[PDB]
Amino acid sequence: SDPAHTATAPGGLSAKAPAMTPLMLDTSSRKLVAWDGTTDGAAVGILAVAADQTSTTLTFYKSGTFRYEDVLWPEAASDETKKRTAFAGTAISIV
Amino acid sequence: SDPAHTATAPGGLSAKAPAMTPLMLDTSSRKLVAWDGTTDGAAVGILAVAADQTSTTLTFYKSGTFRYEDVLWPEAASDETKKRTAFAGTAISIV
Amino acid sequence: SDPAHTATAPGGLSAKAPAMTPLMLDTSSRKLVAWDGTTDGAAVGILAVAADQTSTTLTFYKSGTFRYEDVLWPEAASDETKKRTAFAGTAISIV
After folding, report:
1. Tell me, which fold does domain B1-95 have in CATH?
2. Is B30 in Cβ contact with A85 (below 8 Å)?
3. Which of A68, A94, B92, C59 could form a Cys-Cys staple with B87, CB 3.0–4.6 A?
4. What are A's interface residues with B at a Cβ cutoff of 8 A?
5. Of C10, C6, C38, whose CA–CA distance to C19 is shortest?
6. 3-state DSSP call for residue C93?
7. Are the beta carbons of C19 and C50 closer than 8 angstroms?
8. Where are the domains of chain B?
9. Neighbours of A81 (CB within 10 A)
10. Cα(first)–Cα(last) distance of chain B, in Å?
11. Helix, strand, or coil here: B56?
């Protein structure tokens, strides 16, 4: 059934991020942060619980199938195809 | 023993590709294309339904365990070990 | 609660490695070896059954959630955060 499993890890958000926000790793600290929508293949998960700069840990999805319209993509990710394969290689996919 | 889940995403194949063909992302468009068999760690999935250059969306496995002899590796992938770990880090593995 | 699936792949350990040891791919042979704890994002799995340099094949975890305290991290991995996100992007996560 391809269940959407959650996970937790240190977060380094710099602002509020609603649930369904794509995440990537900060190349410096390696904490989870919002995917910029421009670094190819950097997306690693989807935030499952709303969080902000005070959240020391984030709860995010590490698997499952998510609908293209439900994911809250960053504005900078203007290409539909690149968004649809943003998680290729992970256990997450987009429909 | 682990479920072989499928996923779908934009396709950009250059030619006909049968099911069980290892896929990677086109470095430019980021559409799914056949794994070249030489770019280390580029494989992201295994084509689940035969397709070709006219297929705009492909269906592929994003998880599961597959027999080394069942996967249709590209001729350029000439090293058995490199093929067997081509999916290390994804939900797919080879047996 | 997510299942911890195992997998097998060629091994290139240079010494004895107990279960729960993080694994990465050797850049040259691409066999599974112990993660060095310094190459960012190189961890691809966690050894599931003890092995050593004579082990031609390793059985490892390719998914699941594991306790930070249960994983036998290499000494070089001295930053807690980097260890906690060492598997981000794979089906494995740390709690």
Report:
1. Virus Head Decoration Protein; Chain: A, (2.40.300)
2. yes
3. B92
4. 2, 40-41, 63, 65, 79, 81-82, 84-85, 88-91, 93-95
5. C6
6. strand
7. yes
8. 1-95
9. 18
10. 11
11. coil
